[PDB]
């Protein structure tokens, strides 16, 4: 199932992912927080899963939120680094899904991250071409949920 989704990560898709990550991943704290705050702004209902983080309206200043945001970027770093070996990408994606499945986060709910990713990419001037590439990577994770 996840292997089939990984099959959509073509040579061109993997190239656009690496190129955009070279920029987005160069400031994990800044862009990681940008992603989370954008998710909360566009889909307020998702805050329900983050009660432990406390006052998420504090953004970057919220230590728990900042810690979570930085960590999120290392998961993506992991995914990007495994792009050339489907076997490793799949095992890393399935490992990642375990805790999210436990939290009862459906593929549909997880998909809400696509909007924020598109916006963050656009802030760095990476157009629709790149957003579509990232939507395909997210789809690999969705296949595991």
Question: 110 is in the binding site of which of a copy of itself, ligand HEM, none (Cβ under 5 to 8 A by kind)?
Answer: ligand HEM
Scan residues 44-83 and list those touching a copy of itself (CB under 8 A): 52, 63-64, 66-68, 70-71, 74-75, 77-78, 81-82
CB of 12 to a copy of itself, least distance (A): 25
In angstroms, how far is CA 145 from the centroid of its own chain?
14
Q: After which residues is the chain broken (C to N over 2.5 A)?
A: none
Of 46 and 86, which CB lies nearer to ligand HEM in the complex structure?
46
**Any idea which residue has 């990476």 for tokens?**
126
Residue 114 found at the interface with a copy of itself (CB under 8 A): no
Asked if 25 and 80 count as a contact pair (C-beta separation under 8 A), the reply is yes
List for the chain the helix, strand, coil content (%; round to 5).
80, 0, 20
Instruction: Tell me the three state secondary structure of residue 60.
Output: helix
Which residue number, 23 or 105, has a Cβ lying nearer to ligand HEM? 105
CA-nearest of 11, 37, 12 to 123 is 37
CB of 67 to a copy of itself, least distance (A): 3
- Smaller CB distance to ligand HEM: residue 24 or 76? 76
Q: Does 68 belong to an annotated binding site?
A: no
Residues lying near ligand HEM in the complex (CB under 6 A) are found at: 46, 49-50, 52, 68, 71-72, 75-76, 95, 98-100, 103, 105, 109-110, 112-113
d(CA 13, CA 106): 25
Can you say which residues are annotated as belonging to the binding site for heme b? 100
């Amino acid at each position: 199932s996840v292997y089939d989704a990984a099959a959509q990560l073509t040579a061109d898709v993997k190239k656009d992912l690496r190129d955009s990550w070279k920029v987005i991943g160069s400031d994990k704290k800044g862009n990681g927080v940008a992603l989370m705050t954008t998710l909360f702004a566009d889909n307020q209902e998702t805050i329900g899963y983050f009660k432990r983080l406390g006052d998420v309206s504090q953004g970057m200043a919220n230590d728990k939120l900042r810690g979570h945001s930085i960590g999120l970027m290392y998961a993506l770093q992991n995914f990007i680094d495994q792009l050339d070996n489907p076997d490793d990408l799949v095992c890393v994606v399935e490992k990642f899904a375990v805790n999210h499945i436990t939290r009862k986060i459906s593929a549909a709910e997880f998909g809400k991250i696509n909007g924020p990713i598109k916006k963050v990419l656009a802030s760095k001037n990476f157009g629709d071409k790149y957003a579509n590439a990232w939507a395909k990577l997210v789809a690999v994770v969705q296949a595991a949920l």
